[PDB]
Every structure is written in C-alpha cells, then in structure tokens.
Symmetry: D4
Subunit: 181 residues, 8 copies
C-alpha cells in the first residue's frame, strides 16, 4: 500500500464523492492514486474547482463534462454540438456554458497563470473553447478577459485553493506538490 | 416476458419514478410496456421532457397535468379553468402556465417538427392552448414563436433528447424507434 | 369513533403534518375533529392556504403565526411588535409581512368574499392589520386592493381551493360543508 | 452537574448543532457551559445570529469564520486575505463579505448598542473590518450606517433576539443574564 | 371518481405501499379499485396478512410470491421448483416455506373458515400446497392442523383482522363488505 | 407560559416522541403539561418504561396499548379479547402479552412498591390482568412473582429510573416530584 | 460504447452497489465490463452469492474478503491469520468462517459442480481452505459434505441463481453466457 | 496545526463519531489530539474495541460507560449500583454486564497482556470489577479466564486490532506508536 501520507491528506481534505471520481479517472488512464499521489491531489482539486464553478450562476447554466466517464462525456459533448451548432472540440472540455454557448476548459496550476494558459491555448485548436485558469496563489486568467462567473463565485474558488495550499504546507507536502506539475 | 432489450434500456436510461409513471399511463390505456416497448420509451421521454419543462422558470410558474391519473388530471384542469376563466380544453394538456395563463401541449417527435405541430394543432380545437414541439434532432417549434422558457432551459431539453438518441443508436434500437411513430 | 367519512377524506386529502396541526388547534379550543368534522376540514384548508401564502414571495418575507401554539404565537407576535413598532393586534393574526411591515389575516370562506371581509374587518379594531380573503369559487379580496403576493402564487391557492371543493362534491360532502360556516 | 436550569433552557431553546458548537468553543477557551451558563446562553445566541446573518443575501455572499476551530478559522481568514488583498485582522472576525470585500464583526449585547459598538471599535485596530451590533431590545448599529443585509433579514434577527429574551423572562432567568455582560 | 367512502377508508387504514400493490394487482386483472371498492379492501387485507405471515419465523424462512407481478411471481415459483424438486402448482400461491419445503396459500374470509378452506382445497389439485385460512372473527384453519408459525404470530394477524372489522363497522361499511364475498 | 423549569428538564431528559405522546395524553384528560409539570414528568416516565418493557422479549411478543388514543386503544383491547377469549378489562391496561395471554398493567411509583401494587390491585376487578410495578429506588413487584421479562431487561428499566431520579435531584426537582404522587 | 444488451440486463438485474463493485474488480484486472459483458454478469452473480452467503448464519460469523480492494483484502486475510493461526492461503479466498475457523472459496459455475470443484481444489494447495460450489441448475458441492450454512439459506441462493438464468433465457442471453465459462 | 500525519491516518482509519468522542475525551482531560497524536490513535482504538465488545452478546446485555461525559458516566455507574447492589468502583469502568452483574474494564495494550493486566489489576481495588485485556498481536487475557463473549466476537476484535497495526506499519507510524505506551 506504500502508505503515502499525501494519500491520507487527500482522503481527509476532499469530499468522499470527489475522491471516488478522481480515483476512477486516474485508474481509467492507467494511474494509481496510491503511487502518483501528487496527481491524486491534483485531480481532486481540479474536480472540486470544476464543481464549484458550475455551482456559480443560474441552475441550468452549466453542463458538467468533467467527472463523467470518457464515453459518456463525449456523448454529452456531441449532443451539445448537434443541438447548438458549436464545433466539436478536439479534446474533452470541462463544462459547457448554456448562457454564452461555449465550452469551458478549467485550469488549476502551481506556477504563474501566464504559462499554463499558453500551454492550454496551444493544445486546443478550436479557439472557440473558452479557457479559465486558476492558481493556488490567488490569480486567474480567462479568455478575452471574460471571467464568466461573478467575482464572489471566483473569489470562493481562490479562497479554497489557498486553503488547500496551507493545509499541505502544514503537513510539509506543499514543496513536493508544487515541484510535480 | 418476451425479454425485449428496448425494455432493459428504458429501465437503465430513465428515472425509476418516470418509468413507473409511464407504466401506469400505458396500462391505464390498455398497453403493455413489455410488448409495445417503442412506445414505452416514448412516454418516458415525453414524461421527462414535461418535467424538465416545468423545472424551467419560476417555482410556482407551472402546474403539471401530465403524469397524473386521468380523473385527477381533469380535476386540476377544471380548477384552473373555474379560477382563471380559461376555456376547458377538449383533450388533456400537459402543463399550465400561471405566468401566461394558458395550457401547454408538449410534443416530442421523431420526424420534422413541421408535420407534428400540424397534427397537434389540427387535433385541438381550442386555439388558446399553447403548443411547443421538440425533436430528437435538436429542433423546436412553438405557437406564435413564443417558446415560453429561456433558451438555456430549452437547450438542456434538446441536449437530453439527442443523448437518448445516441444511446439507442449505440444499442441498434434507434432505427426501430424512429420508424414506429 | 362515530366513523364520519368527512374525517377519512380530510386525512386522505391533506398533508399529515397539516392534519396534526389542525387537530392540536381544535383540541386546544375544546373541539373534537372526529365530531366537528366540517370544521376539521376547514382548519386544514385554512392552514394549508396560510402555508402556501408564506411560500410565495422571498424566503425571509413572512413570519408564520398560524399553526403555532397560542402562547408561542403571542410570543412571536410580541417580538415583532417590540422590534418594528407596529401596534399589538387584539386578535391573533395569521402571518406577518416583513416586506410591508404589517400583519396579515387570511380568510377562507364558503360564501361571497364581500360578507366575510366585512365580518373580518368588523372583528379587528386595528385597521393596520392587512386582510386577505379567499373563496372556494376562485374569488379573492384584499385590503386596499393590495393582494401582497404575485398573481401566480394567488392563482395556485385558488386552484387548490377549487380542487378541494371538487373532491368533496364527488363524495357528496360539499353540500354539508358549505352549509356549516 | 450543578443542575443549573439556565442550562436546560439553552438546550431546549437552541438548535442541537448550535449548542454543540457553543460547547466546543467554550471548552476550547477553558470554560464550562455547566458552570458559566449565562455565557453558554450568549455564545449560542451569538452563534445563531451569525448563522442567520450569513443566510441573508446571496448563496456565495458570506464566508463563515465563527463556529470553526481556532486554527481552521485563522486558515480561512488567511486564504481570504492572500486572495483579495485585505489586511489580516488582529482578532478573529465572524464573517467575510465577498460582495463588499470586508470582514464583519457581529455583536449581540444586553445594553445600549452605543457602548458595545465603542468597545468593539476600540478593540480592533483594523478600521477596515465592518462592525454590526444587535441588541435584545430591537436596536442595531453598523459601521458607516451600512447595515449590509436587507431590512427583512435584519428584522428576523431582531424578532428572534426578542423571543429569546421573553422565554428567559418567563423562566425568571432574564434578570441574571442581563446583569452578566 | 364516484367518491366511494370505502375507498377513503382503505387509503387511511392500510399502508401506502400495500395500497399501491393492491391497485396494481386489481388493474392487472381489469378491476377498478375506485369501483370495486369492497374487493379493494380485500386485496389490501389479504396482502397485509401475507406480509405479517412472512414476518413470522426466521429471516430467510419465507419467499413472498403474492404482491409480485404475474410474470415475476411465476418466475420465482419456477426457480423454487427447479431447485427443491417440488411440483409446480397449477395456480399462483402466496408464499413458499423454505423450512417445510411447501407453498402456502393464505386465505382471508368473511364467512366460516370451513367453507372457504373447502373451496380453496377443491380449487388446487396439488395437495402438497399448504393451505392456511384466517377469518375476521378470529378463527383459523390450516392443512393437517399444521399452522406453520408460532401462536403469537398468528394471534397478531387475528387481532389486526378484528381491528379492521371494527373500523369498518364504525363507518357502517362492514355490512356491505361481509355481503360481497 | 409560567416558565416552570421542571418542564425544561422533561423536554431535555425524554425523547421528543415520548414528550409528544405524554402531552396528547394529558391534554386529552384536560391537563396542562405546562402547569401540572410533576405529572408531565410522570407520564413521560411511565411511557418510556412501557416502551422499554415491550422492547424486552421477542419481536411479536407484546401489543402496546399505552400511548394510543383512547378510542384506538380500546379498539385494540377489543380485538385482542374477541380473538383470544380473554375477558375485557374494566380499565385500559398498558400492554398485552401474546406469550402468556394476559394484559399487563405497568406501574411506576415514588413510594414503596407494596402500597402502589395494593392500590393497583384494588382498582381492577379482573384479577386475570397481570400487574408489574417499578420504583425509582430499584424495586419491582409483579403478580404471582411472575416478572414476565428477563432480569437484564428489568435491570435496564431500573437503571433508567434511578438515572432520572439523579438528574432531578441535581436540579433540586426531586423533592417536589416525590411529594406529588 | 458497443451497446451490448447483456450490459443493460446486468444493470437492471443486479444491485447498483454490486454492479459498482464488479466494475471496480474487472477494471482492476484490466477488463472492460462493456466489452467482456458475459464476465460482467458473472462477477455480479458471484458477488451477490458471496453476500447472501455471509447473510446466512449469525451476525459476526463471517468476514467478507471478496469485494474489497486487493491490498485491503490481503490485509484482512493477514490479520485473520496472525490472530487465529490459520495458514495464509496462496490465492485470495471469498469469506472467513469465525465459527469453523477456515476460509471459504465460493464457486458459481455454468457446468456440473463436479468439474468446477476439481479445478478449484487443484488450484489451491492449502487443503484447509473450505470450498463451496453452486450451480445455476440448483446443485451444490462442499468440502467434506460440510455445507456450512442452513438448508434454507443455501436454498435461497439456488432460487436466485435459477431466477437469473430464467431472466437471461427470456432475453436470449443464456446460451452465450453458458458457453463462455 | 503541526500537520502530524498520524492525525490524518486516525481520521481516515476510524469512524467519524469515534473520532469525535475521542477528541472530546482528550480535550476534557487537557490533551490535544493534534499534539498527542499517538494517544489520539489509542483512545480511538480503545473506543472502537469497547463498542464492538458491547455489540457482542444480546441486545440489552451491556451498558456502555466509556464514551460518555464524566458526570454522565458516573451517573449511570451509580444507577447500576443503587439498583443491583454492586459496589461502586473507585475508577470509571468501560462497560457493565447485565448478564454477569459486573463492570468490565477493557484494555488494549502494545506490549504483552501479562504486564498490562497486572497494572490494571493493581490500579483497581474492587476485585469484583472484571478485567479483559486485548493486544495488537492477537492475544487476550480476562479475569478468572472468563472471556465473557463468544470466541467469534473476540476474534473480530483481534482481527481489527491487527488490521490497524498493519495500516500504521505501512505508513511507518507503528514504531512510534508501540514505543509510546
Ligand atoms: C449529478 C451527480 C453529481 C454531479 C456533481 C455535482 C456535485 C455537487 C453536489 C452539491 C449538491 N453539493 C454542494 C455542497 C456539497 C454538495 O454535495 N457539488 C458542487 C460542490 C462540490 C459538489 O460535490 N452536482 C451538480 C448537480 C447535483 C450534483 O450532485 N455530477 C458529476 C459529474 C456530472 C455531474 O453532473 N451525478 C450525475 C450522475 C453521476 C453523479 O454522481
Ligand atoms: C410532486 C410529485 C412528482 C411531480 C413530478 C416532478 C418531478 C421532479 C423531481 C425533482 C425533485 N427532480 C429534479 C432532479 C431529479 C429530481 O428528482 N423532476 C423534474 C426533473 C425530473 C423529475 O423527476 N416534481 C415537481 C414538484 C416536485 C417533484 O417531484 N409530479 C408528478 C405529476 C404531478 C407532479 O407534480 N408528485 C405529486 C403527487 C404524485 C407525485 O409523485
Ligand atoms: C418550520 C416548521 C413548519 C412550518 C410550516 C411550513 C410548512 C411547509 C413545508 C414545506 C417544506 N413544504 C412545501 C412542499 C411540501 C412541504 O412540506 N409547507 C408549505 C406548503 C405546505 C407545507 O407543509 N414551513 C415553512 C418553513 C419550513 C416549513 O416546514 N411552521 C409551522 C408553524 C410555524 C412554522 O414556521 N415548524 C416550526 C416549528 C414547528 C414546525 O413544525
Ligand atoms: C456547513 C456546516 C455548518 C455551517 C453552519 C450553517 C448552518 C445553517 C444550517 C441551515 C441548513 N439551516 C437553516 C434552517 C435550519 C438549518 O439547519 N444554519 C443557518 C440558520 C441556523 C443554522 O443552523 N450552514 C451554512 C452552510 C450549510 C450549513 O449548514 N458552518 C459551521 C461553521 C462554518 C460553516 O460553514 N459545517 C461546515 C463544516 C462543519 C459544519 O458543520
Ligand atoms: C422487498 C420489497 C417489499 C416486500 C414486502 C415486505 C414488506 C414488509 C416491510 C417491513 C420492512 N415492514 C414491517 C413494519 C412496517 C414495514 O414496512 N412488511 C411486513 C409488514 C407489512 C410490510 O409492509 N418486505 C419483506 C422484505 C422487506 C420488505 O419490504 N415484497 C413485496 C412483494 C415481494 C417482496 O418481497 N420489495 C421487493 C421488490 C419490490 C418491493 O417493494
Ligand atoms: C409504532 C409507533 C411507535 C410505537 C412505540 C415504540 C417506540 C420505540 C421506538 C424504537 C425504534 N426505539 C428504540 C431505541 C430508540 C427508539 O426510537 N421505543 C422503545 C424505546 C423507546 C422508544 O421510543 N415502537 C415499537 C414499534 C416501533 C416503535 O416505534 N407505538 C406508540 C404506541 C403504540 C405503538 O406501537 N407508532 C404506532 C402508530 C403511532 C406511532 O408512532
Ligand atoms: C459493509 C459495506 C458493504 C459490505 C457488503 C454487504 C452488503 C449487504 C447489504 C445488506 C444491508 N443488504 C441486504 C438486503 C439488501 C442490502 O443492501 N448485502 C447482502 C445481500 C446483498 C447486499 O448488498 N454488507 C454486510 C455488512 C453490511 C453490508 O452492507 N461489504 C463489501 C465488501 C466488504 C463488506 O463487508 N462496506 C464495507 C466497506 C465498503 C462497503 O461498502
Ligand atoms: C447510543 C449512541 C452511541 C452509542 C455507541 C454505539 C455505537 C455503535 C453504532 C452501531 C449502530 N454501528 C455498528 C455498525 C457501525 C455503527 O454505526 N457502534 C458499534 C460498532 C462501532 C459503533 O459505532 N451504539 C450502541 C447503541 C446504538 C449506538 O449507536 N453510545 C456512545 C456512548 C454511550 C452509548 O451508548 N449515543 C448515546 C448518546 C450519545 C450517542 O451518540
Ligand atoms: C495524466 O493524465 C490524466 C488525465 C485525466 C483527465 C484528463 N482530462 C481533462 O479534462 C483534464 N486533465 C487535467 C490534468 C490533471 F487533472 C492532472 C494532471 C495533468 C492534467 F492535464 N487538467 C484539466 O484541466 C482537465 O480538463 C485524469 C488522470 N490522468
Ligand atoms: C397510445 O395512447 C396513449 C396515450 C397516453 C397518454 C395520452 N395523453 C397525452 O397527453 C399525450 N400522449 C402522447 C403520446 C405518447 F406519449 C406516445 C404515443 C402517442 C402519443 F400521442 N404525446 C403527448 O404529447 C401527450 O400530451 C399514454 C399511453 N398511451
Ligand atoms: C372554533 O374556534 C376555533 C378557532 C381556531 C383557531 C382560531 N384562530 C385563528 O387565527 C383563525 N380561525 C379561523 C376559523 C376556522 F379555522 C374555523 C372556523 C372558524 C374560524 F374563525 N379562520 C381564520 O382565518 C383564523 O386566522 C381553531 C379551532 N377552533
Ligand atoms: C470568554 O471568551 C470566550 C470567547 C469565545 C469566542 C471568542 N471569539 C469571538 O469571535 C467572539 N466572542 C464573543 C463573546 C461571547 F460570545 C461571549 C462572551 C464574551 C464575548 F466577547 N462575541 C463576539 O461577537 C465574537 O465574535 C468563546 C468562549 N469564550
Ligand atoms: C378478482 O380476481 C382478482 C385476483 C387477484 C389476485 C389473484 N391471486 C391470488 O393469489 C389470490 N387472490 C384472492 C382474492 C382476492 F384477494 C379478492 C377476491 C377474490 C380472491 F380470490 N385471495 C387469495 O388468497 C389469493 O392468493 C387480484 C385482483 N383480482
Ligand atoms: C390524571 O389522569 C391521567 C391519566 C392519564 C392516562 C391514564 N391511563 C393509564 O393507563 C395510566 N395512568 C397512570 C398515571 C399517570 F401516568 C400519572 C398520574 C396518575 C396515573 F394514574 N399510570 C399508569 O400506570 C397507567 O397505565 C394521562 C393523564 N392524566
Ligand atoms: C491521559 O489520560 C486520558 C484518559 C482518558 C480516559 C480515561 N478513562 C478510561 O476509562 C480509560 N483510559 C485508557 C487510556 C487511554 F485510552 C489512553 C492512554 C492511557 C489510558 F489509560 N484505557 C482504558 O482502558 C480506559 O478504560 C482520555 C484521555 N486521556
Ligand atoms: Mn477536464
Ligand atoms: Mn480542465
Ligand atoms: Mn399529455
Ligand atoms: Mn404532450
Ligand atoms: Mn389564524
Ligand atoms: Mn385566518
Ligand atoms: Mn466571533
Ligand atoms: Mn462577534
Ligand atoms: Mn391467498
Ligand atoms: Mn400503567
Ligand atoms: Mn469465489
Ligand atoms: Mn474507560
Ligand atoms: Mn478501558
């Protein structure tokens, strides 16, 4: 079992359902949450951020693509395209905005938001897909400076991100986590 | 039991309460969900669409007529008429709009929305009853181009409709379903 | 047990919690729901109408006085007066409007709303207390034509009132109920 | 166990979860709710007021600092500061307003709101932290006359405060409670 | 809706799940619980008796055949036969005794248990199927005087049966019910 | 509200459902739990003892008569008599023993069990009804020295009775309670 | 998604938690429940049989090894060995009998129980591990003719096994399933 | 917060309610679960063992003293003494056996059960109090070789104890824990 203590923190810090979705996502890609425990903390973080993001705005505003199984996520991605007319993205996005009619790619990075946004923008060729990056320091960067949600909703996500960083720094796990991305 | 596999898909694809309401509705009209399984999938679909439709808008906006028993649905249809003054419709409608003061007939078709709207409009003589048609392809057609709900609420219904079509096409049940209406 | 069948209808027509509150209210005033079964149906009706009324509007808009015990209802009536400055009403009202700063007396009558409003207005001397009457036929009458809630919220109450009347007429209990007020 | 009857009233008057949070807060500071029962009633009162306060406004508007453990409350206080840029307060505040970008110190006093606000303002050196005082008589005083929430939300808190006072006066516990602050 | 008051008593006297199973059983056989209300009370009674019967004895002692759908009940009846070797009964029984290896036919009659047992024994040709009759007066008659369960379990069923009779006699519905079998 | 502190202890010491049943029982007999608070503690105590008593023994062993409404309790008392043949008791008993075929009168006294048993035996003329007395000191006395349940079940009731006495002595309410029977 | 209809039957026939445990077990071994759907039905069947098996007997009789994750199942297998002294089995067993002090290997086969027992006995070298085989036809074979549980508990498992076979035969999936082991 | 990783393991290994009871027990004695984390794991372990111990045997067999607050635990200890006649123990015990009429002191040690039993027996002067020691290795020692419960119930406790030891050894926390008692 290796007994990694980053693993015990992830199970105590995150929601049991978020932990289970992160485990299924990693195992589907041939990754062990017990071995690649720094990632394990990252999919949980990215998953939670995606969920609070969809919690912002109206009730029927967002369609959640992240967290589903690969086949089901691509099925919903299709149905959105064949009903609105948006182009099918090359890579699986995180959300869909029914209010702005675009897919959203949510990013959570340990470095400056400038580089990660560049890597995210260079990966996707469909420039229509909206990009929204968050950082553990409290920064954010969105496409065309369009941050989609309200300031209070984005502030809650930043607060949670910094709380996670503090809890890992208290357990001396932050240095390894930052130097793993 | 015939062992129809359209039946197993309906039970796995739809909500248990929606399946139970569709079964009671079919049996009340002398129809077997185990035999007329293409219909069985259609009442479930029509039922779900009616429910998400009422989920759009405000909390007290819609009165749900579809899904009730025949006697109870006609009792509520009455009470709405004897309190607002709207004319009693000849056939049982699906919803009532407290905001626009009209009954809504929700349609879900496998062909072009043009024909089905014509059949729905020719059936009812009370032209006051509002008609709103949806299609599995992603089209919609409403009376006087008044689509009642927001675009995001209607888009969610279209996305779900196309997801159902994909799941049946994956199980090779879509061709029989489309050629049954 | 007398075996009155109006009693069985009240238990089947109304919510179990509403039935229990009506029973405690009647017993507190020395009345048997098993004997005075026409009243029993009326306190349940009045109770439900009061509850849907408070369900209209915003979340913190209304304070519910009806349904509480006599001592507790007068305690809350006080606290509202000693904090807002409104005069203490002589008789226990049903609600309090934090938005309009007034107590509301809800009426549900079997005759024309004109007479019942007159009896309700002649009873209270505090003309500041707002009066809102409903009828089983679908009429309503409020003080200064100020109906407080939205039209859709009031329409839902009227629809429910007429549904109750129909269910009793089907059981031949409506004639006795109307001739009891 | 001393058998103080102020203790039994607190357990009957307040929510079980609010009582448990008040007990943990007192024990953390080396105080016995069974001995210092007048305080015990006050932390419960202050806790409830803080909770209804956060219930006002939008869903993601307030971050709740009061009620958490000391280390966790300071962790969230940090994360809010390192993400918004607000100065770290010297003493632990009660809430944080994501809408106005400020910490809120909620006060509940048994005397005139004028003195308590002065003591609260003299304690904190960070004049940016917003102060909102409530009284058991129905008064309130906020920094710069900015009362943050709606009138109806604040009125509900005042009504509850006066209800608590009445319930203690009925049990002859109000005189000791007022002369303990 | 006919407004039969036997119907309202059945809905108030019996469990909501038992009422729903009785309604599905009657509708499956082309019977209206709103019209044939004396039967409606009888399937509910027979259903409840069958359920308390299986509640007697050990946990895994009885397999419940009554209450299931016709196809599913015959499927379980088969599986019991193809695993134990018991002969397939001609008519659907109520229970199966894993302890005594026999099917049980439960009877609830309004006349003397002697006649009903004779009619039940003449109907089935498989003399291996055990017969257990109950009466509303407090009598019981079982095959070979083998009453299967304990005396206390059977006494509880008799007590409930007489309670149902009293509740109907109080509502003047007992005379019609007894003269309907 | 009188603000009696025996009342607050009863609400904190006993189960919410037991408190509600005791309140309905007292109000049915024209007694105020807020005024006759020493009784209020006694019906709760007697009610709880009756419930733990039925919790002893097998699952279907006891029929609970105490706690029901007067008409319903007499209905069940009848059905037990018309099915087993036991004589109808003159006064309402507490339980019925399906194992020993007798009604049980449970007593909870503040004096010696000798006197209370004599008063209980002189009240009832049906000597068949079993009598079982408990005391707050830890004594018990049953008819024909037949204590019905196991020693461990009766010991749990005695322990609970002495715990209640201690909690009242700590609040200085025991002296008034003992001198009220 | 392949749209296999054996998959839809497994999801409708088995418990949602049993389906989830079977999916995790297959994915852990690099198997797709959507592709190897005949297996998918078998792990669900084997899982359910293991669960009903542990449901037989006393409450603390069995320790469940099957269904856990590989590392956790081996951890519990150890703790049982290091506390009772039983030899560590070479392969992961299904249960442990605290009453007989032995591990149990549960088998569910589509052929005669004779061959499968031979394959199961030849696989394990620890002859101390008890073997209990079940068949879809209604047969069973246990080590030393020691069938561990009662006849009624084993009969329930056989009945369920034959019910599963019938449901697949009705959907024409039984022939492929039997010819896959 | 110190960020001790023994703390994270305790929160992941033990039940949330057991963790909360251990935290209240430590804080009551002036101990920090965040600092004295080796103890923190021990009170959780001792608490769980006490709970499974009471889960063995009949339903009303054991009275649970451990886990309660100090005043309440001594209140129940009294009531047991003043009703059965057993002598009041000098130190708070863990359980009470209604079947054997004695208090039980449960021990969980990291060394040989011989020494710990001696320390436990030398501490208490009331030789009537029964002593039952468990070890993380799988040993147990009880007074007069009377192990109270069944072998299967005690074996489950031993298995759980060894599982806890393995989980800590995997996280390299076992060496510090054993060298802390
Ligand atoms: C729908 C359901 C799960 C949703 C995920 C998401 C979780 C949501 C839960 C809410 C309640 N809150 C808020 C407070 C705590 C809590 O619990 N939040 C948001 C914050 C963290 C969290 O947990 N939502 C949104 C709709 C309801 C729901 O639960 N998902 C998973 C991926 C796709 C999807 O829509 N589904 C769908 C099928 C499988 C499944 O599980
Ligand atoms: C009221 C009740 C049933 C309602 C039908 C409808 C179902 C609603 C459930 C909601 C919650 N969501 C949303 C997320 C999943 C879920 O579950 N949605 C909407 C989406 C699909 C669905 O299921 N609604 C609306 C009010 C509450 C409720 O449940 N119906 C049935 C016909 C009449 C009616 O009003 N009733 C009334 C008596 C019998 C009964 O069952
Ligand atoms: C607060 C609680 C009871 C409330 C009465 C009222 C009932 C409300 C329930 C809601 C949910 N809906 C809506 C759908 C069905 C349902 O159930 N509605 C409204 C419609 C009918 C109904 O039932 N509300 C409002 C707040 C939450 C709640 O339940 N009351 C009783 C008198 C005072 C009061 O505030 N209280 C308070 C202490 C005792 C008690 O019971
Ligand atoms: C989040 C949770 C507790 C929250 C405290 C607060 C309590 C809230 C409960 C709501 C529901 N209502 C309203 C009706 C009755 C009720 O119950 N209200 C408000 C009124 C009184 C009350 O009780 N809220 C707000 C979010 C959901 C929730 O419960 N707290 C405690 C301190 C930090 C915090 O956010 N947490 C967080 C982890 C530990 C815990 O317990
Ligand atoms: C299994 C389930 C329903 C069972 C019927 C039966 C009902 C049982 C409920 C128990 C709990 N008690 C007792 C106190 C009140 C209550 O509620 N009792 C017995 C007394 C009246 C009653 O209601 N049982 C037994 C197992 C669990 C359960 O519920 N049935 C229905 C027919 C087949 C069957 O096994 N099933 C199975 C699939 C559909 C469904 O609904
Ligand atoms: C049946 C139901 C109430 C029962 C009373 C009785 C209460 C029982 C509850 C159990 C669970 N435990 C035990 C742990 C805590 C708890 O809660 N115990 C026993 C100890 C104290 C207590 O509370 N029982 C027994 C059957 C299930 C049930 O609840 N009563 C009330 C009078 C008649 C009757 O049978 N009924 C029936 C209709 C109205 C109602 O409420
Ligand atoms: C403990 C828990 C799951 C258990 C598996 C097992 C399931 C049990 C559920 C019971 C209730 N019934 C019976 C009626 C329907 C139902 O639901 N049955 C038995 C029949 C089918 C079924 O489902 N049991 C037994 C203890 C309680 C429980 O649930 N398992 C899974 C593997 C290890 C284990 O002990 N655990 C443990 C941690 C993860 C998890 O999930
Ligand atoms: C009564 C209640 C708590 C009890 C403690 C104990 C916990 C019990 C829970 C059971 C269910 N299981 C078993 C499976 C998982 C689970 O959860 N087990 C046993 C194993 C671990 C566990 O958790 N029991 C026994 C009665 C019901 C109950 O819960 N306690 C705490 C100290 C005194 C006491 O009696 N009380 C009483 C008032 C405060 C409180 O909390
Ligand atoms: C090693 O590869 C994987 C991928 C997944 C899901 C991929 N699908 C996404 O959509 C995805 N992944 C990531 C991401 C991460 F969460 C951790 C590390 C690196 C990443 F790129 N960030 C996103 O923002 C995102 O949208 C799960 C497990 N392992
Ligand atoms: C075979 O007849 C039936 C009818 C009902 C309910 C009828 N009442 C409606 O209200 C209704 N029916 C249908 C509909 C359908 F769902 C499937 C096929 C054909 C249809 F017309 N579409 C609607 O939109 C609608 O409102 C149930 C079972 N069988
Ligand atoms: C016989 O007297 C009573 C009174 C109460 C509550 C009185 N308090 C009110 O507040 C109240 N009562 C009534 C009302 C009614 F519900 C039925 C008949 C006559 C009425 F006036 N209508 C209201 O609108 C109202 O507000 C309960 C039982 N019996
Ligand atoms: C004796 O000291 C303590 C302090 C705490 C929490 C302190 N932290 C706060 O934040 C806090 N305390 C108080 C407060 C009170 F609730 C009662 C008496 C005096 C007070 F100042 N009023 C607030 O408004 C507030 O924000 C808990 C127990 N004992
Ligand atoms: C009109 O025919 C039906 C039959 C059923 C179920 C038949 N299957 C049984 O198994 C069954 N029926 C009856 C029974 C009854 F419940 C009421 C009247 C007459 C009866 F014979 N008594 C039993 O004991 C029994 O086992 C449902 C509706 N209508
Ligand atoms: C003032 O009269 C009442 C009577 C009832 C219920 C009567 N029915 C019983 O069955 C009953 N009553 C009492 C009892 C008591 F609980 C308190 C004081 C005196 C008593 F005799 N002890 C029993 O043991 C018992 O069985 C409720 C309220 N007030
Ligand atoms: C540092 O002192 C404490 C004591 C308590 C509860 C004492 N009451 C008992 O009853 C108790 N304590 C312990 C025990 C332990 F769990 C850990 C270390 C040493 C111990 F002796 N083992 C038992 O078996 C037992 O019955 C809580 C916190 N700190
Ligand atoms: Mn993604
Ligand atoms: Mn992303
Ligand atoms: Mn319709
Ligand atoms: Mn329609
Ligand atoms: Mn009123
Ligand atoms: Mn009114
Ligand atoms: Mn504070
Ligand atoms: Mn404050
Ligand atoms: Mn039958
Ligand atoms: Mn009694
Ligand atoms: Mn196996
Ligand atoms: Mn202890
Ligand atoms: Mn101990």
């Amino acid at each position: 079992p290796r007994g990694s203590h980053m693993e015990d923190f992830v199970r105590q810090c995150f929601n049991p359902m978020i932990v289970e979705l992160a485990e299924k996502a990693m195992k589907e890609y041939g990754e062990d949450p017990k071995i690649e425990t720094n990632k394990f903390a990252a999919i949980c973080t990215h998953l939670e951020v995606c969920f609070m993001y969809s919690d912002g705005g109206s009730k029927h505003r967002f369609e959640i693509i992240e967290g589903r199984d690969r086949i089901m996520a691509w099925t919903v991605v299709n149905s959105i395209c064949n009903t609105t007319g948006v182009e099918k993205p090359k890579f699986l996005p995180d959300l869909y905005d029914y209010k702005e009619n675009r897919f959203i790619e949510i990013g959570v990075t340990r470095r400056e938001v400038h580089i990660y946004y560049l890597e995210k923008a260079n990966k996707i060729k469909s420039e229509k897909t909206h990009i929204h990056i968050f950082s553990f320091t409290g920064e954010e960067m969105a496409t065309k400076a369009d941050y989609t949600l309200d300031e209070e909703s984005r502030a809650r996500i930043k607060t949670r991100l910094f709380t996670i960083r503090q809890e890992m720094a208290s357990r001396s796990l932050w240095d390894s986590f930052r130097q793993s991305e």
